[PDB]
C-alpha cells in the first residue's frame, strides 16, 4: 500500500479543454507515457512520478504549486507560474519575466527550486490543478531515471546537468539545467466540483487572482494545505529535523517555567487555569497554586472564541487567579492571562505559508496556525525579557566576564555583584529566549505584571 500504483486510474476531464479528445479511460502508466517519459519497467525506488495524498503530506516541505497558461502548444508562448510567486515565459523559438527559450528557462527553474528547497526537503512535489499545458511542459525541464545520489554529497539527487553529465542535490546544483526525478500530485483528482478559484475562495481571502500562472500555483498549494492540514489534522505524522527544532522546543519549556514561576511569585494567584494541550503537565510543579486543566487541541482553522471556551458555565470563575494560554490561540485573551502565541508572519525553514493568512509550522509535527492578530492582545502587554533565580550562588565544576544587567533578578544582583553561576545561567537563558523569539513565538502578560515585585522573594 506504500506507493501510488501506475495502474491506478486518472480522471482526464480536467485535461479535455487543453487536450480535446483525451480518453476518459487512462492510467498513470499511460499519462506518464503521453507526457513523454518512460518508466522502463523499473524497480529503482522511483515507481511513479505521481504520489498519494499520504505521501504528499509526509513531503509538505517539498510542495511547489505549479501552473502553465497559454499566452497566444508548440505554436504559442507559455507562462510558467510557481507558488514562489515567479512567472517565466518560455518560447518554442508578482514577478513577471519576458519570453525566452527552454534551454535558458530550465536553468532558472533549477536555481529557483534549489534556493527554495535546499533547507526544506530532499525532493520537489509539484502541486497541480492539472488542465494540460503544465503536464505537457514537463518534458522540457524534467529528466527521470533510477534514484541517484548527489555527485558532491550523500544526499539524493534532485537535479541533472547535460553539460557535465552529472547529478546534484539542491545544495550542489549550481549551473545544472534539469529537474531530476521530481514528484507531483494533481489536486483535481481528489473530487471537487467547479474550478480552482471557486474552491480556493471558500477557505481563503488572502490570495487574490490576477489571472496569472503564479496566482493559480499559489491557490493550488493553498487549497491543498487547507485539505491536508486545516480541515483534516494528523499529529501522528512525524517530520525530520532540518533546523533548530530541538533547541527551540527546549527554549519553549525553559521560558514557560520561568514566566509562570515569576507570575506566581509576583502576584501569588490562588488558582491557575491552564487552557490548551490536553497532554499538558504543570510547568511549575513546586508552585503553591490550585492548578486546573482545560483541554483544547491546537486550533488549525479559526482561533477559538473565548466566549465558547469559558461561558456555557471548571473553576467556572476564570476571572479568579491567572489563565495560562501556551499556544492556545483565542480571538481575545482575558486581562488575567499569561500567553505564548505563534506569529504566523515569521520567516523560517520551520514555517511554511498557509491558508487565509495562517501558516503551517512544521517542528516534529505539522500545525496549521490561524493568522496572527494584534487585536487579540488588547487586554495584555508584551512581556519584557527577565531572568529570575532563587537558586543558591554556587558555581560547581564557561570563560567569564562579570555580568551587569538590570534584568538578572537574583540575590547576588540585589546584593550589588552577580555571582558566576547566575551569570552563566542568565546568558544561557537569554540565548534560549532569543532562540524562541526568532522562531516566531511572542509573549504577552496581564498589565499589572511588574518584575520589581520579584526582589522581595529574597530578603
Ligand atoms: C499529458 C498528455 C495526455 C494526453 C495527451 N494526448 C492524448 O490523449 C491524445 C492527443 C489528442 C487527444 O488524444 N497528450 C498529453
Ligand atoms: Zn549534494
Ligand atoms: Zn489561499
Ligand atoms: Zn548568584
- 380 CB-near residues (< 8 Å, 6+ apart): 333, 335, 337, 339, 444, 445, 446, 447
Closest CA to 121 of 192, 54, 64, 45: 64
Any idea where the domains of the chain sit in the sequence? 13-231, 245-457
Cα 283 from Cα 280, distance rounded (Å): 8
- Our CA dihedral for 170, 365, 352, 48, rounded to 10 degrees, sits at 50
Closest CA to 188 of 22, 29, 50, 353: 50
Closest CA to 64 of 93, 84, 79, 80: 84
128 SS3 class: strand
- Our CA dihedral for 345, 346, 349, 352, rounded to 10 degrees, sits at -10
CB distance 135 to ligand 1 below 6 Å: yes
290 is catalytic: no
Q: Do 69 and 78 touch, CB atoms closer than 8 A?
A: yes
DSSP 305: P
Residue whose C-alpha cell is 471557486: 198
DSSP 353-413: E-STT-EEEEESEEEEE----GGGGTT-EEPPP-EE--S-S------------TTEESHHH
Q: Do 168 and 150 touch, CB atoms closer than 8 A?
A: yes
**Nearest-CA residue for atom 8 of ligand 1:** 22
E strands present in 170-259: 178-180, 183-186
- 208 CB-near residues (< 8 Å, 6+ apart): 215
CB distance 22 to ligand 1 below 6 Å: yes
Closest CA to 300 of 376, 191, 227: 227
Q: Grid coordinates representing 204? A: 481563503
Residue 14 Cα distances to 29, 156, 171, 290, angstroms: 18, 33, 36, 59
109 SS3 class: helix
Phi, psi of 421 (to 5 degrees): -50, -55
Give the active site residue among 59, 131, 134, 368: 134
Cα 153 from Cα 131, distance rounded (Å): 37
Q: Which residues pair with 338 in a beta bridge?
A: 324, 445
Give the distance (Å) from ligand 4 centre to CA of residue 408. 9
**Nearest-CA residue for atom 5 of ligand 1:** 34
Cα 151 from Cα 132, distance rounded (Å): 34
211 is catalytic: yes
Helix 245-267 to helix 420-438 angle (10° resolution) is: 110
67 is catalytic: yes
Deposited experimental method? X-ray
CB distance 19 to ligand 1 below 6 Å: yes
How does strand 78-82 pair with strand 387-388?
Answer: unpaired
Distance, CA of 439 to chain centre: 11
Q: Is 277 annotated as a binding residue?
A: yes
Distance, CA of 418 to chain centre: 40
Q: Do 327 and 299 touch, CB atoms closer than 8 A?
A: no
Q: Do 303 and 376 touch, CB atoms closer than 8 A?
A: yes
CB distance 144 to ligand 1 below 6 Å: no
Write down the H helix ranges in 268-349: 306-310
Sign of CA dihedral 265, 267, 268, 273: negative
Give the distance (Å) from ligand 4 centre to CA of residue 263. 21
- 169 CB-near residues (< 8 Å, 6+ apart): 118, 122, 150, 152, 153, 155, 156, 157, 158, 159
- The string over 72-98, giving b where at least 16 C-beta atoms fall within 10 Å of a residue's C-beta and e elsewhere, is eeeeeebbbbbbbebbbbbeeeeeeee
Closest CA to 359 of 370, 348, 350, 349: 370
- Our CA dihedral for 359, 360, 363, 366, rounded to 10 degrees, sits at 150
Cα 206 from Cα 257, distance rounded (Å): 36
**Measured at the alpha carbon of residue 437, what is the angle toward residues 286 and 295, in degrees to the nearest 5?**
50
DSSP 177-194: -EEES-EEEEGGGG--SS
Cα 140 from Cα 280, distance rounded (Å): 52
Cα 52 from Cα 340, distance rounded (Å): 36
DSSP 37: -
Q: Order the strands of the 337-342 sheet from edge to edge.
A: 290-295, 271-276, 322-326, 337-342, 441-445, 381-382
- Ligand 1 atom closest to Cα of residue 20: 12
- The string over 299-328, giving b where at least 16 C-beta atoms fall within 10 Å of a residue's C-beta and e elsewhere, is bbeebbebeebbeeeeeeebebbbbbbbbb
Enclosing H/E stretch for 135? helix 133-136
CB distance 136 to ligand 1 below 6 Å: yes
Cα 220 from Cα 196, distance rounded (Å): 7
**Nearest-CA residue for atom 14 of ligand 1:** 34
Terminus-to-terminus CA distance in the chain, angstroms? 67
Distance, CA of 357 to chain centre: 12
Enclosing H/E stretch for 68? strand 63-70
Q: Do 185 and 51 touch, CB atoms closer than 8 A?
A: yes
Amino acid at each position: 500500500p506504500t506507493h501510488l500504483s501506475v495502474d491506478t486510474k486518472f480522471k482526464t476531464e480536467g485535461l479535455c479543454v487543453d487536450i480535446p479528445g483525451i480518453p476518459k479511460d487512462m492510467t498513470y502508466r499511460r499519462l506518464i507515457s503521453m507526457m513523454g517519459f518512460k518508466m522502463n519497467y523499473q524497480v529503482n525506488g522511483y515507481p511513479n512520478m505521481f504520489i498519494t495524498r499520504e505521501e504528499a503530506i509526509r513531503h509538505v516541505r517539498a510542495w511547489i504549486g505549479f501552473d502553465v497558461e497559454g499566452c497566444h502548444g508548440t505554436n504559442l508562448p507559455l507562462q510558467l507560474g510557481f507558488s514562489t510567486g515567479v512567472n517565466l515565459v518560455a518560447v518554442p523559438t508578482p514577478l513577471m519575466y519576458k519570453g525566452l527559450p527552454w534551454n535558458v528557462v530550465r536553468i532558472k527553474i533549477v536555481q529557483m527550486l534549489s534556493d527554495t528547497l535546499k533547507n526544506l526537503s530532499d525532493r520537489v512535489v509539484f502541486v497541480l490543478w492539472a488542465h494540460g499545458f503544465e503536464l505537457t511542459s514537463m518534458k522540457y525541464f524534467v529528466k527521470i531515471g533510477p534514484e541517484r545520489t548527489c555527485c558532491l554529497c550523500d544526499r539524493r539527487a534532485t537535479c541533472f546537468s547535460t553539460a557535465s553529465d552529472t547529478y546534484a542535490c539542491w545544495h550542489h546544483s549550481i549551473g545544472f539545467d534539469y529537474v531530476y526525478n521530481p514528484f507531483m500530485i494533481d489536486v483535481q483528482q481528489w473530487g471537487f466540483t467547479g474550478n480552482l478559484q471557486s474552491n480556493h475562495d471558500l477557505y481563503c481571502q488572502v490570495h487574490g487572482n490576477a489571472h496569472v500562472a503564479s496566482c493559480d500555483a499559489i491557490m493550488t498549494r493553498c487549497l491543498a494545505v487547507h485539505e491536508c492540514f486545516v480541515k483534516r489534522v494528523d499529529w501522528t505524522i512525524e517530520y525530520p529535523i532540518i533546523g533548530d527544532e530541538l533547541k527551540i522546543n527546549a527554549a519553549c519549556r525553559k521560558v514557560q517555567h520561568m514566566v509562570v514561576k515569576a507570575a506566581l511569585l509576583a502576584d501569588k494567584f490562588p488558582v491557575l487555569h491552564d487552557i490548551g494541550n490536553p497532554k499538558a503537565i504543570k510547568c511549575v510543579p513546586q508552585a503553591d497554586v490550585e492548578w486546573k486543566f482545560y483541554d483544547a487541541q491546537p486550533c488549525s482553522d479559526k482561533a477559538y472564541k473565548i466566549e465558547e471556551l469559558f461561558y456555557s458555565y471548571h473553576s467556572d470563575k476564570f476571572t479568579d487567579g491567572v489563565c495560562l494560554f501556551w499556544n492556545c490561540n483565542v480571538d481575545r485573551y482575558p486581562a488575567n492571562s499569561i500567553v505564548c502565541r505563534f506569529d504566523t508572519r515569521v520567516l523560517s525553514n520551520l514555517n511554511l505559508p498557509g491558508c487565509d493568512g495562517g501558516s503551517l509550522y512544521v517542528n516534529k509535527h505539522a500545525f496549521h496556525t490561524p493568522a496572527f492578530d494584534k487585536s487579540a492582545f488588547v487586554n495584555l502587554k508584551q512581556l519584557p525579557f527577565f531572568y529570575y533565580s532563587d537558586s543558591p550562588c554556587e558555581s560547581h565544576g564557561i570563560d567569564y566576564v562579570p555580568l551587569k544587567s538590570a534584568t538578572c533578578i537574583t540575590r547576588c544582583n540585589l546584593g550589588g555583584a552577580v555571582c558566576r553561576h547566575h551569570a552563566n545561567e542568565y546568558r544561557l537563558y537569554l540565548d534560549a529566549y532569543n532562540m524562541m523569539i526568532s522562531a516566531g513565538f511572542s509573549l504577552w502578560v496581564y498589565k499589572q505584571f511588574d518584575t520589581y515585585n520579584l526582589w522581595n522573594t529574597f530578603t
